[PDB]
Amino acid sequence: AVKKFKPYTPSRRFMTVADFSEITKTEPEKSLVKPLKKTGGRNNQGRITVRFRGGGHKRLYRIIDFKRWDKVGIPAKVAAIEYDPNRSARIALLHYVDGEKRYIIAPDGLQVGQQVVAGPDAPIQVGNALPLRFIPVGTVVHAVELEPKKGAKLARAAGTSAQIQGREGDYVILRLPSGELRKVHGECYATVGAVGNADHKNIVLGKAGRSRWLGRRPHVRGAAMNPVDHPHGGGEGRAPRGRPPASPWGWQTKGLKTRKRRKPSSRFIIARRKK
Amino acid sequence: MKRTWQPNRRKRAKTHGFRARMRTPGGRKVLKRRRQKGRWRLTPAVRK
RNA sequence: CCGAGGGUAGGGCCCGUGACUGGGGCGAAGUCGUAACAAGGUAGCUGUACCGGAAGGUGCGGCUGGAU
RNA sequence: UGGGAGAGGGUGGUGGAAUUCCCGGAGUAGCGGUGAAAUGCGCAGAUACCGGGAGGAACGCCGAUGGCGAAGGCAGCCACCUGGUCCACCCGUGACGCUGAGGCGCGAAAGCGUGGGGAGCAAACCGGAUUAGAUACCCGGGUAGUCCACGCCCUAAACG
RNA sequence: CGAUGUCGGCUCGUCGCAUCCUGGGGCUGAAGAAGGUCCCAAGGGUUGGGCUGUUCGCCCAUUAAAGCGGCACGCGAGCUG
RNA sequence: GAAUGCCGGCAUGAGUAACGAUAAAGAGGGUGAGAAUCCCUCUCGCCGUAAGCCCAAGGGUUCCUACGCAAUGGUCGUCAGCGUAGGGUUAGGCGGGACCUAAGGUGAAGCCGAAAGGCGUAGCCGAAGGGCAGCCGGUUAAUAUUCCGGCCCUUCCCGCAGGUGCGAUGGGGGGACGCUCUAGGCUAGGGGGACCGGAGCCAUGGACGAGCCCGGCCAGAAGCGCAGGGUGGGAGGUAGGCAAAUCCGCCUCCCAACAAGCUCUGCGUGGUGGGGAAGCCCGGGUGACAACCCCCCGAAGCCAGGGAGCCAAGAAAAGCCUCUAAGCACAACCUGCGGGAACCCGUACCGCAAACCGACACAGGUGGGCGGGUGCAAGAGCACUCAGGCGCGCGGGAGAACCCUCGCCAAGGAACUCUGCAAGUUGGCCCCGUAACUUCGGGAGAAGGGGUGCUCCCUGGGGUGAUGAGCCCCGGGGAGCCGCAGUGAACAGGCUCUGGCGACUGUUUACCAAAAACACAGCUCUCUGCGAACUCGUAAGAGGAGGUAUAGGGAGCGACGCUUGCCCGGUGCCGGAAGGUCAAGGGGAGGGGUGCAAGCCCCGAACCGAAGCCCCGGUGAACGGCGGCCGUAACUAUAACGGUCCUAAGGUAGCGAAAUUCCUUGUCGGGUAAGUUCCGACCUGCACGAAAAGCGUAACGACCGGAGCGCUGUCUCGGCGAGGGACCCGGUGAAAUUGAACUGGCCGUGAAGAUGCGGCCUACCCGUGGCAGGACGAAAAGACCCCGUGGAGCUUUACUGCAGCC
RNA sequence: GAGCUAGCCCUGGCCAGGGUGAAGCUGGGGUGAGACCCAGUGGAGGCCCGAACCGGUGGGGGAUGCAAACCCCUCGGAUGA
Ligand SMILES: [K+]
Ligand SMILES: [Mg+2]
Ligand SMILES: [Mg+2]
Ligand SMILES: [Mg+2]
Ligand SMILES: [Mg+2]
Ligand SMILES: [Mg+2]
Ligand SMILES: [Mg+2]
Ligand SMILES: [Mg+2]
Ligand SMILES: [Mg+2]
Ligand SMILES: [Mg+2]
Ligand SMILES: [Mg+2]
Ligand SMILES: [Mg+2]
Ligand SMILES: [Mg+2]
Ligand SMILES: [Mg+2]
Ligand SMILES: [Mg+2]
Ligand SMILES: [Mg+2]
Ligand SMILES: [Mg+2]
Ligand SMILES: [Mg+2]
Ligand SMILES: [Mg+2]
Ligand SMILES: [Mg+2]
Ligand SMILES: [Mg+2]
Ligand SMILES: [Mg+2]
Ligand SMILES: [Mg+2]
Ligand SMILES: [Mg+2]
Ligand SMILES: [Mg+2]
Ligand SMILES: [Mg+2]
Ligand SMILES: [Mg+2]
Ligand SMILES: [Mg+2]
Ligand SMILES: [Mg+2]
Ligand SMILES: [Mg+2]
Ligand SMILES: [Mg+2]
Ligand SMILES: [Mg+2]
Ligand SMILES: [Mg+2]
Ligand SMILES: [Mg+2]
Ligand SMILES: [Mg+2]
Ligand SMILES: [Mg+2]
Ligand SMILES: [Mg+2]
Ligand SMILES: [Mg+2]
Ligand SMILES: [Mg+2]
Ligand SMILES: [Mg+2]
Ligand SMILES: [Mg+2]
Ligand SMILES: [Mg+2]
Ligand SMILES: [Mg+2]
Ligand SMILES: [Mg+2]
Ligand SMILES: [Mg+2]
Ligand SMILES: [Mg+2]
Ligand SMILES: [Mg+2]
Ligand SMILES: [Mg+2]
Ligand SMILES: [Mg+2]
Ligand SMILES: [Mg+2]
Ligand SMILES: [Mg+2]
Ligand SMILES: [Mg+2]
Ligand SMILES: [Mg+2]
Ligand SMILES: [Mg+2]
Ligand SMILES: [Mg+2]
Ligand SMILES: [Mg+2]
Ligand SMILES: [Mg+2]
Ligand SMILES: [Mg+2]
Ligand SMILES: [Mg+2]
Ligand SMILES: [Mg+2]
Ligand SMILES: [Mg+2]
Ligand SMILES: [Mg+2]
Ligand SMILES: [Mg+2]
Ligand SMILES: [Mg+2]
Ligand SMILES: [Mg+2]
Ligand SMILES: [Mg+2]
Ligand SMILES: [Mg+2]
Ligand SMILES: [Mg+2]
Ligand SMILES: [Mg+2]
Ligand SMILES: [Mg+2]
Ligand SMILES: [Mg+2]
Ligand SMILES: [Mg+2]
Ligand SMILES: [Mg+2]
Ligand SMILES: [Mg+2]
Ligand SMILES: [Mg+2]
Ligand SMILES: [Mg+2]
Ligand SMILES: [Mg+2]
Ligand SMILES: [Mg+2]
Ligand SMILES: [Mg+2]
Ligand SMILES: [Mg+2]
Ligand SMILES: [Mg+2]
Ligand SMILES: [Mg+2]
Ligand SMILES: [Mg+2]
Ligand SMILES: [Mg+2]
Ligand SMILES: [Mg+2]
Ligand SMILES: [Mg+2]
Ligand SMILES: [Mg+2]
Ligand SMILES: [Mg+2]
Ligand SMILES: [Mg+2]
Ligand SMILES: [Mg+2]
Ligand SMILES: [Mg+2]
Ligand SMILES: [Mg+2]
Ligand SMILES: [Mg+2]
Ligand SMILES: [Mg+2]
Ligand SMILES: [Mg+2]
Ligand SMILES: [Mg+2]
Ligand SMILES: [Mg+2]
Ligand SMILES: [Mg+2]
Ligand SMILES: [Mg+2]
Ligand SMILES: [Mg+2]
Ligand SMILES: [Mg+2]
Ligand SMILES: [Mg+2]
Ligand SMILES: [Mg+2]
Ligand SMILES: [Mg+2]
Ligand SMILES: [Mg+2]
Ligand SMILES: [Mg+2]
Ligand SMILES: [Mg+2]
Ligand SMILES: [Mg+2]
Ligand SMILES: [Mg+2]
Ligand SMILES: [Mg+2]
Ligand SMILES: [Mg+2]
Ligand SMILES: [Mg+2]
Ligand SMILES: [Mg+2]
Ligand SMILES: [Mg+2]
Ligand SMILES: [Mg+2]
Ligand SMILES: [Mg+2]
Ligand SMILES: [Mg+2]
Ligand SMILES: [Mg+2]
Ligand SMILES: [Mg+2]
Ligand SMILES: [Mg+2]
Ligand SMILES: [Mg+2]
Ligand SMILES: [Mg+2]
Ligand SMILES: [Mg+2]
Ligand SMILES: [Mg+2]
Ligand SMILES: [Mg+2]
Ligand SMILES: [Mg+2]
Ligand SMILES: [Mg+2]
Ligand SMILES: [Mg+2]
Ligand SMILES: [Mg+2]
Ligand SMILES: [Mg+2]
Ligand SMILES: [Mg+2]
Ligand SMILES: [Mg+2]
Ligand SMILES: [Mg+2]
Ligand SMILES: [Mg+2]
Ligand SMILES: [Mg+2]
Ligand SMILES: [Mg+2]
Ligand SMILES: [Mg+2]
Ligand SMILES: [Mg+2]
Ligand SMILES: [Mg+2]
Ligand SMILES: [Mg+2]
Ligand SMILES: [Mg+2]
Ligand SMILES: [Mg+2]
Ligand SMILES: [Mg+2]
Ligand SMILES: [Mg+2]
Ligand SMILES: [Mg+2]
Ligand SMILES: [Mg+2]
Ligand SMILES: [Mg+2]
Ligand SMILES: [Mg+2]
Ligand SMILES: [Mg+2]
Ligand SMILES: [Mg+2]
Ligand SMILES: [Mg+2]
Ligand SMILES: [Mg+2]
Ligand SMILES: [Mg+2]
Ligand SMILES: [Mg+2]
Ligand SMILES: [Mg+2]
Ligand SMILES: [Mg+2]
Ligand SMILES: [Mg+2]
Ligand SMILES: [Mg+2]
Ligand SMILES: [Mg+2]
Ligand SMILES: [Mg+2]
Ligand SMILES: [Mg+2]
Ligand SMILES: [Mg+2]
Ligand SMILES: [Mg+2]
Ligand SMILES: [Mg+2]
Ligand SMILES: [Mg+2]
Ligand SMILES: [Mg+2]
Ligand SMILES: [Mg+2]
Ligand SMILES: [Mg+2]
Ligand SMILES: [Mg+2]
Ligand SMILES: [Mg+2]
Ligand SMILES: [Mg+2]
Ligand SMILES: [Mg+2]
Ligand SMILES: [Mg+2]
Ligand SMILES: [Mg+2]
Ligand SMILES: [Mg+2]
Ligand SMILES: [Mg+2]
Ligand SMILES: [Mg+2]
Ligand SMILES: [Mg+2]
Ligand SMILES: [Mg+2]
Ligand SMILES: [Mg+2]
Ligand SMILES: [Mg+2]
Ligand SMILES: [Mg+2]
Ligand SMILES: [Mg+2]
Ligand SMILES: [Mg+2]
Ligand SMILES: [Mg+2]
Ligand SMILES: [Mg+2]
Ligand SMILES: [Mg+2]
Ligand SMILES: [Mg+2]
Ligand SMILES: [Mg+2]
Ligand SMILES: [Mg+2]
Ligand SMILES: [Mg+2]
Ligand SMILES: [Mg+2]
Ligand SMILES: [Mg+2]
Ligand SMILES: [Mg+2]
Ligand SMILES: [Mg+2]
Ligand SMILES: [Mg+2]
Ligand SMILES: [Mg+2]
Ligand SMILES: [Mg+2]
Ligand SMILES: [Mg+2]
Ligand SMILES: [Mg+2]
Ligand SMILES: [Mg+2]
Ligand SMILES: [Mg+2]
Ligand SMILES: [Mg+2]
Ligand SMILES: [Mg+2]
Ligand SMILES: [Mg+2]
Ligand SMILES: [Mg+2]
Ligand SMILES: [Mg+2]
Ligand SMILES: [Mg+2]
Ligand SMILES: [Mg+2]
Ligand SMILES: [Mg+2]
Ligand SMILES: [Mg+2]
Ligand SMILES: [Mg+2]
Ligand SMILES: [Mg+2]
Ligand SMILES: [Mg+2]
Ligand SMILES: [Mg+2]
Ligand SMILES: [Mg+2]
Ligand SMILES: [Mg+2]
Ligand SMILES: [Mg+2]
Ligand SMILES: [Mg+2]
Ligand SMILES: [Mg+2]
Ligand SMILES: [Mg+2]
Ligand SMILES: [Mg+2]
Ligand SMILES: [Mg+2]
Ligand SMILES: [Mg+2]
Ligand SMILES: [Mg+2]
Ligand SMILES: [Mg+2]
Ligand SMILES: [Mg+2]
Ligand SMILES: [Mg+2]
Ligand SMILES: [Mg+2]
Ligand SMILES: [Mg+2]
Ligand SMILES: [Mg+2]
Ligand SMILES: [Mg+2]
Ligand SMILES: [Mg+2]
Ligand SMILES: [Mg+2]
Ligand SMILES: [Mg+2]
Ligand SMILES: [Mg+2]
Ligand SMILES: [Mg+2]
Ligand SMILES: [Mg+2]
Ligand SMILES: [Mg+2]
Ligand SMILES: [Mg+2]
Ligand SMILES: [Mg+2]
Ligand SMILES: [Mg+2]
Ligand SMILES: [Mg+2]
Ligand SMILES: [Mg+2]
Ligand SMILES: [Mg+2]
Ligand SMILES: [Mg+2]
Ligand SMILES: [Mg+2]
Ligand SMILES: [Mg+2]
Ligand SMILES: [Mg+2]
Ligand SMILES: [Mg+2]
Ligand SMILES: [Mg+2]
Ligand SMILES: [Mg+2]
Ligand SMILES: [Mg+2]
Ligand SMILES: [Mg+2]
Ligand SMILES: [Mg+2]
Ligand SMILES: [Mg+2]
Ligand SMILES: [Mg+2]
Ligand SMILES: [Mg+2]
Ligand SMILES: [Mg+2]
Ligand SMILES: [Mg+2]
Ligand SMILES: [Mg+2]
Ligand SMILES: [Mg+2]
Ligand SMILES: [Mg+2]
Ligand SMILES: [Mg+2]
Ligand SMILES: [Mg+2]
């Protein structure tokens, strides 16, 4: 439930921040953090390959368990729910009765001090993880494996969820966060419930500075450049695009589909995305 | 104002030094060329 | 010391006036259409919304002060 | 204290009918629409028929000249939370009442903000007819909206 | 074109006379006063402002008058820009 | 003999400009062949959050001493960062290595690439980060946490004693972390003292004083005291921490809990060891048996891994501790004690600068620490001044024009000018008071105004301490004194009204543009289901991202408010398994060459045959576009209305002579005595218009317009004054430029603007200070224009290719 | 060749003093409970004034310079992109 500020500065007008109500522990589990290497959007050549990145706050990566089938049948307790600067979602700290500690991404409604567990015989209860073939049709579900034992790939971002639409042979049918209908293998694990922090998208950065804190450097328009730099470059005074709107590298950028045609997963995508 | 020469011994050695030249094909030909020319010093002097 | 009042500066209220502008009332025989009164020829009125030279039209919901 | 009727309200669930779309089957030359038509859709296989699926909205019969609320209003079904009311017994308090400027709250539709949702419908808008014209009535499309959540708006032939 | 800096202003003048004023005249449809027109005349004089980069022009208040041109549209090894 | 030729030499400009911050000098005495310039003394001035002191980088002997002055030094030189020589840098504890990791680099495994080579896990390397044991004083001409003195401490080896399941590159704990605000107690540092110590002083009217001036400390092991940090204890279970595990993690149980105890650090004290001023006398001796105490102020530093709040969520690895595994338990480790052992490199000097980077002893640039006092509200601001350091390596005169920097100005007060450019004005603090509008924060320091010093008296609260004195910190009241003036000097907003543009803080053309440009939160379209799209790369491999549609890419628009209309014919993109066209390939009717012949060989129709294009649809916050003519109303004028042609459709709301209006200073109104600008309107909008967004918008702006008030040397209109130059004398001494020159005016002429030709007029020879009309003056082989079948950047439905993609 | 400059990476450092006074919290009022109002506490911010530091707005000087971008006066930012 986003928090607002009074207009005591020009930027505090519209700036909004998360309420951080669900957070119960404010410094990470030391055995589960390792250093995040900030890249600046530069590859092993030294070259920028993703423009306008860098200069954001320092961060520690928190190792997340995206393969909960790791520990079938061993219950765990929800110790605490923490802030994670590396994703939109919040994370949950789990004390397994095993003695082992892990992070998972926190689903909406998950309360501290509750048991969660993983496996075929798991309860259809928020926080548990099962293969998709054991989850009742109609159930919303997150952190879904796209292939068996390859790791949770789908529905991870804050507020996101997938719904099971039916089964077909070894496969189940999911509606992705995007609206796409896709067959996903039954043996793929997924956690019942939606991801939490759904008010995430209602956050208003409020000023240029908050963008810079997030590692986002200023974005310069093609129209603001010269012909040497960009298709939209140049022109005496302001100028309409004067050609079909294009990226820096010339390909069209209003409508041009770019999904590779002969991709093998096409056999598994029933219906392309909504909206 | 601030001019272009801002001497720094580590910088100098690690950039123009003997070992730097030897690591690169281009570097070795530089040494080869300066020897052929008879340069008294193949590499910039730096006190290390 | 107070003190008429004079002076500097900033406010509040009222009246008069102002290029131009908004609609309003009125005016024997102008122009366009015909919205309402008959089921007025699409029943009408209605709050609202959007649209249209103009009356009006349409949507949503409501009233009979609606004919048969 | 003991009982009763009820679409009174809020929350979470859930059922079938139907419309549209999507895949499959079977099948051919038109379907749709009107006062009559045209636009529109259809040999790129439509309409009509069968099976499968997705989704939203509204709840047929019961249903009434019915019932509930202070009004606006409220209609599938289930459960939970909650308001008002009526009747019986004649038990308790002992005038504790009526009204009510201000205040406060509720307040159909439309409309507004932020998210979502979107089948059908349908302002605007487009097209086809009609017409002297037709910024309409009629036909084919169609976006807000109509639906949900939270927050505003506070109007009405809010009427008995 | 192996460069003759190009508007206007400011400063500093100097010259022409086809004379704006002052001096001398003839004609007048010159009563006087004040004008008109032409002639002689370059000695001196020929204002302060509003507007615009402006030259020019319009306008305000004056004035005897508020003249017109040349000097590389005088003058940037003098200034401004 | 010419090439703005090349190399060298030497002229001209010229004894000219200049001699590098306007912080400033004067005398006396030395030294010497020679002295404004070297040494000494006295006086004077400048810096003093430095122009002082200590590190770091870079520099590399510049350091100290003696002897020197040819050159270097912008003059001089006896001096020197200069020449010659000799001397000088001392570490187990400081810094680096024999320790650890960061980005990055390298790289057994492995991957990739014609070659060269590119990747790459572990590992290795890599520092101003982690870790780790030395403080005070003395000494040299020059080194010192290094030598010496005092008091401390680390590691390694060996030995002894005591204790223990010892043992690891493996497991675990720890190291280990942000921003802002901040408590308690200390220390650094500082102010005061009528107390303690001191050579002395009494002046010129007064003072022998509770007088002036000087100083009143530093280090220190154990122990102790004060203040902090860190940290629960036991037991049972145990499937996790990739073997094991008594450790760690998880569960249960008992006790403990704002504590205590244990431990660790800071501070105080502490055996002891040091230091110790003014002044006098010659760096030293005295002072001196120096004294070494009290009160106050007090950190940003210490306790520290403290506490609180916040979102943007804040390195690693070793040292260290614990657990065990092989192995070994004659060992091995732990603790205490003792002796022994302890290596390599740096160490001089400069270091906001004459020793570094700028060709220079160059008004520029250069990271970290200390940076005293008094006053001004605070402070690192400002003025003065301590310690300390300097007077900036040409001087002496003169007292012109003119230039620079500065001071003042009668009356007027923007009349200056493109423009109040510039300079005035205002100026700090305290109190009073403060408008439209607003998004309710603001606008606001709005505007405007009163106060401000010193003396005496009364009184209120706080910190310290003790509750009191003293000291220090905030105040209130009354009565007086002086001057032109009390933030008396120095530092320290002029203000208001009204438009345009951009929401805002930010960003930009290093070196002519800071803006209305870029960015920006925010809105929209679009792509992307993850081995994502996209990007770099031949590739492997990377980024994307250890992210997963509330995410990532691309594009436009640009807070917010109210909105964003019509056109899909064309171009783009999107959908359409049909039809048309369609390459290699399939097919082989039917031909051709050759051979005696089997055969060998070549051409080859129909028909099958992808993407692409055609064709059918969709789609504008996709590329884009959004009409003409004629007529019509009962005064006129004007047309709500009509006719017709065309288009894919004919500009909607809002706005409009505009950052857009050509005609144009449109016309009217406002403001002015006067207004091509400005502001408000009108609308025949040459040629606004809705995300290359339309119309508004409080706040903001070193943006660009217009007006007013205040005040002014901007101006009428100029005057005087100061200093640094310009001038004269002594010293040193450039520069571009230059065919040679014995280099006048007019009117002509001449390749059309003549010192140089003609006629005339004028003119004795040579300089110095000045002014800029000419020498078509200097500088730059015109940057405009053209020319060259010259060049380069850029564009596209120019041609032709290539990457990439299908 | 990134010892200048531009961006990013890793690791350190710096920002005198003064002003404004958001949320929250406490207390008081308020109501059925609330919203909310007032005071105190608090110390937010691409907040305000202003040194260091980072800049380079206007003007003057300089123009064979002290300087191949400097000097003076003035001005922008100064807890943040
Ligand atoms: K040109
Ligand atoms: Mg807000
Ligand atoms: Mg508010
Ligand atoms: Mg939360
Ligand atoms: Mg919280
Ligand atoms: Mg770790
Ligand atoms: Mg990373
Ligand atoms: Mg790499
Ligand atoms: Mg990119
Ligand atoms: Mg980048
Ligand atoms: Mg999170
Ligand atoms: Mg699958
Ligand atoms: Mg968002
Ligand atoms: Mg970040
Ligand atoms: Mg962004
Ligand atoms: Mg941009
Ligand atoms: Mg551009
Ligand atoms: Mg541009
Ligand atoms: Mg380029
Ligand atoms: Mg190109
Ligand atoms: Mg291009
Ligand atoms: Mg373009
Ligand atoms: Mg352009
Ligand atoms: Mg442009
Ligand atoms: Mg243009
Ligand atoms: Mg455009
Ligand atoms: Mg175009
Ligand atoms: Mg294009
Ligand atoms: Mg592509
Ligand atoms: Mg999809
Ligand atoms: Mg630089
Ligand atoms: Mg150089
Ligand atoms: Mg550097
Ligand atoms: Mg170095
Ligand atoms: Mg270094
Ligand atoms: Mg270096
Ligand atoms: Mg470097
Ligand atoms: Mg290198
Ligand atoms: Mg090297
Ligand atoms: Mg080679
Ligand atoms: Mg080789
Ligand atoms: Mg040699
Ligand atoms: Mg070399
Ligand atoms: Mg009077
Ligand atoms: Mg009043
Ligand atoms: Mg009306
Ligand atoms: Mg009439
Ligand atoms: Mg009618
Ligand atoms: Mg009709
Ligand atoms: Mg009708
Ligand atoms: Mg019309
Ligand atoms: Mg309509
Ligand atoms: Mg058909
Ligand atoms: Mg067919
Ligand atoms: Mg649906
Ligand atoms: Mg019925
Ligand atoms: Mg009774
Ligand atoms: Mg309502
Ligand atoms: Mg719709
Ligand atoms: Mg809407
Ligand atoms: Mg009724
Ligand atoms: Mg020329
Ligand atoms: Mg020449
Ligand atoms: Mg020339
Ligand atoms: Mg006369
Ligand atoms: Mg005359
Ligand atoms: Mg002219
Ligand atoms: Mg002229
Ligand atoms: Mg004119
Ligand atoms: Mg006269
Ligand atoms: Mg003239
Ligand atoms: Mg001319
Ligand atoms: Mg001309
Ligand atoms: Mg001229
Ligand atoms: Mg000039
Ligand atoms: Mg000129
Ligand atoms: Mg000249
Ligand atoms: Mg000249
Ligand atoms: Mg100009
Ligand atoms: Mg010759
Ligand atoms: Mg030549
Ligand atoms: Mg030569
Ligand atoms: Mg020579
Ligand atoms: Mg020679
Ligand atoms: Mg010579
Ligand atoms: Mg000479
Ligand atoms: Mg001369
Ligand atoms: Mg000179
Ligand atoms: Mg000089
Ligand atoms: Mg100076
Ligand atoms: Mg000074
Ligand atoms: Mg003297
Ligand atoms: Mg002297
Ligand atoms: Mg001398
Ligand atoms: Mg001498
Ligand atoms: Mg001396
Ligand atoms: Mg003397
Ligand atoms: Mg000082
Ligand atoms: Mg300093
Ligand atoms: Mg040197
Ligand atoms: Mg010499
Ligand atoms: Mg000499
Ligand atoms: Mg000699
Ligand atoms: Mg010399
Ligand atoms: Mg010199
Ligand atoms: Mg001598
Ligand atoms: Mg030495
Ligand atoms: Mg030692
Ligand atoms: Mg060794
Ligand atoms: Mg190769
Ligand atoms: Mg290395
Ligand atoms: Mg180190
Ligand atoms: Mg660290
Ligand atoms: Mg050490
Ligand atoms: Mg010690
Ligand atoms: Mg050691
Ligand atoms: Mg170990
Ligand atoms: Mg840590
Ligand atoms: Mg950590
Ligand atoms: Mg923060
Ligand atoms: Mg101490
Ligand atoms: Mg003090
Ligand atoms: Mg006394
Ligand atoms: Mg003293
Ligand atoms: Mg001590
Ligand atoms: Mg175990
Ligand atoms: Mg043990
Ligand atoms: Mg003695
Ligand atoms: Mg500090
Ligand atoms: Mg600390
Ligand atoms: Mg802490
Ligand atoms: Mg590491
Ligand atoms: Mg044994
Ligand atoms: Mg032990
Ligand atoms: Mg060794
Ligand atoms: Mg040393
Ligand atoms: Mg030093
Ligand atoms: Mg400096
Ligand atoms: Mg320094
Ligand atoms: Mg020096
Ligand atoms: Mg230089
Ligand atoms: Mg010097
Ligand atoms: Mg002192
Ligand atoms: Mg002050
Ligand atoms: Mg001097
Ligand atoms: Mg100086
Ligand atoms: Mg002199
Ligand atoms: Mg003189
Ligand atoms: Mg000066
Ligand atoms: Mg005076
Ligand atoms: Mg005056
Ligand atoms: Mg005035
Ligand atoms: Mg005045
Ligand atoms: Mg003026
Ligand atoms: Mg003037
Ligand atoms: Mg100007
Ligand atoms: Mg002042
Ligand atoms: Mg106000
Ligand atoms: Mg006002
Ligand atoms: Mg306003
Ligand atoms: Mg307000
Ligand atoms: Mg202020
Ligand atoms: Mg007073
Ligand atoms: Mg006094
Ligand atoms: Mg006392
Ligand atoms: Mg100020
Ligand atoms: Mg006012
Ligand atoms: Mg801008
Ligand atoms: Mg701006
Ligand atoms: Mg704007
Ligand atoms: Mg705006
Ligand atoms: Mg903006
Ligand atoms: Mg902006
Ligand atoms: Mg700022
Ligand atoms: Mg520039
Ligand atoms: Mg440039
Ligand atoms: Mg430039
Ligand atoms: Mg540049
Ligand atoms: Mg340049
Ligand atoms: Mg400039
Ligand atoms: Mg510009
Ligand atoms: Mg600026
Ligand atoms: Mg820009
Ligand atoms: Mg922009
Ligand atoms: Mg917007
Ligand atoms: Mg979209
Ligand atoms: Mg590429
Ligand atoms: Mg990664
Ligand atoms: Mg508004
Ligand atoms: Mg409106
Ligand atoms: Mg179109
Ligand atoms: Mg189309
Ligand atoms: Mg199209
Ligand atoms: Mg034959
Ligand atoms: Mg077009
Ligand atoms: Mg076009
Ligand atoms: Mg329209
Ligand atoms: Mg509209
Ligand atoms: Mg107009
Ligand atoms: Mg006008
Ligand atoms: Mg306009
Ligand atoms: Mg314009
Ligand atoms: Mg225009
Ligand atoms: Mg024109
Ligand atoms: Mg005009
Ligand atoms: Mg014009
Ligand atoms: Mg006019
Ligand atoms: Mg008018
Ligand atoms: Mg007027
Ligand atoms: Mg007009
Ligand atoms: Mg435009
Ligand atoms: Mg505005
Ligand atoms: Mg505004
Ligand atoms: Mg600004
Ligand atoms: Mg500005
Ligand atoms: Mg003015
Ligand atoms: Mg003057
Ligand atoms: Mg003077
Ligand atoms: Mg003389
Ligand atoms: Mg001489
Ligand atoms: Mg000399
Ligand atoms: Mg000659
Ligand atoms: Mg001659
Ligand atoms: Mg001569
Ligand atoms: Mg002559
Ligand atoms: Mg001629
Ligand atoms: Mg001539
Ligand atoms: Mg002559
Ligand atoms: Mg001749
Ligand atoms: Mg002659
Ligand atoms: Mg002749
Ligand atoms: Mg003559
Ligand atoms: Mg002379
Ligand atoms: Mg002369
Ligand atoms: Mg001349
Ligand atoms: Mg001249
Ligand atoms: Mg010439
Ligand atoms: Mg000339
Ligand atoms: Mg000349
Ligand atoms: Mg030149
Ligand atoms: Mg040439
Ligand atoms: Mg040429
Ligand atoms: Mg040239
Ligand atoms: Mg030409
Ligand atoms: Mg040609
Ligand atoms: Mg040719
Ligand atoms: Mg060419
Ligand atoms: Mg070029
Ligand atoms: Mg080319
Ligand atoms: Mg560097
Ligand atoms: Mg700061
Ligand atoms: Mg204040
Ligand atoms: Mg307060
Ligand atoms: Mg609090
Ligand atoms: Mg600020
Ligand atoms: Mg400047
Ligand atoms: Mg100025
Ligand atoms: Mg240059
Ligand atoms: Mg220059
Ligand atoms: Mg300067
Ligand atoms: Mg200054
Ligand atoms: Mg300032
Ligand atoms: Mg500031
Ligand atoms: Mg500050
Ligand atoms: Mg910060």
Coordinates of N, CA, C and O (backbone and C1' of nucleotides) in Angstrom, one line a residue, chain F residues 20-23:
Chain F
rG20 P 59.3 42.3 -14.0 O5' 58.2 41.4 -14.6 C5' 56.8 41.5 -14.3 C4' 56.1 40.2 -14.4 C3' 56.4 39.2 -13.4 O3' 55.7 39.5 -12.2 C1' 56.4 38.2 -15.5
rA21 P 56.6 39.6 -10.8 O5' 55.6 38.9 -9.7 C5' 54.6 39.7 -9.0 C4' 53.7 40.4 -10.0 C3' 53.0 41.6 -9.5 O3' 52.8 42.6 -10.5 C1' 51.4 40.1 -10.2
rU22 P 53.5 44.0 -10.4 O5' 52.8 44.7 -9.2 C5' 53.5 45.0 -8.0 C4' 52.7 45.9 -7.1 C3' 51.4 45.4 -6.6 O3' 51.5 44.5 -5.5 C1' 51.2 47.7 -7.2
rA23 P 50.4 43.4 -5.2 O5' 50.6 43.3 -3.6 C5' 50.3 44.3 -2.7 C4' 51.4 44.4 -1.6 C3' 52.8 44.6 -2.1 O3' 53.0 46.0 -2.5 C1' 52.8 42.9 -0.5

